[PDB]
Amino acid sequence: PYSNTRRPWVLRRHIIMKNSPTKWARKYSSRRDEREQEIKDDYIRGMGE
């Protein structure tokens, strides 16, 4: 069985429950995603050697 690992719909659609300092950073701030994309980019760049 292959399935998604996304958060519950209530966590990302409730008018109140989805608002927090960390959830806003995940949703609107690219600081986390830009840094984690480096690890993904390092994978391809380390093939040729």
């Binding site: 292959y2 984690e36 690890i39 993904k40 994978y43 391809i44």
Partner: protein
């Protein structure tokens, strides 16, 4: 040392071994810096999220799209309804396409 990453049956889960090897590397006296343990940290984070492997899957799907390859020709067959895991799909000799019973085991 407190227990972390405990499986649903009281034992270590899938990613405890990665976490344990990180702790052993960090607390080992022979090391001068934490640089040798950097690769072990990536493996533990890869065990939980699989972000690099999902990225690899993203490239393969995108690469096949530009080549014109059909997803059903190079992918893996799958069934979306559990009641339709029929004996014909399972390859049984006398396998029929009638739905299987999943109401009450």
């Amino acid at each position: 040392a407190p227990l972390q990453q405990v499986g649903r049956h009281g034992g270590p889960n899938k990613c405890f071994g990665e976490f344990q090897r990180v702790v052993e590397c960090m607390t080992n006296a022979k090391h001068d810096s934490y640089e040798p343990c950097n690769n072990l940290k990536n493996d533990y984070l890869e065990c939980r999220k699989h972000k690099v492997e999902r990225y690899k899957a993203f490239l393969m799907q995108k690469h096949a799209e530009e080549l014109g390859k059909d997803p059903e020709e190079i992918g893996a067959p799958f069934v979306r309804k559990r009641r339709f895991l029929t004996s014909k799909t399972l390859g049984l000799v006398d396998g029929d396409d009638y739905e299987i019973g999943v109401e009450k085991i």
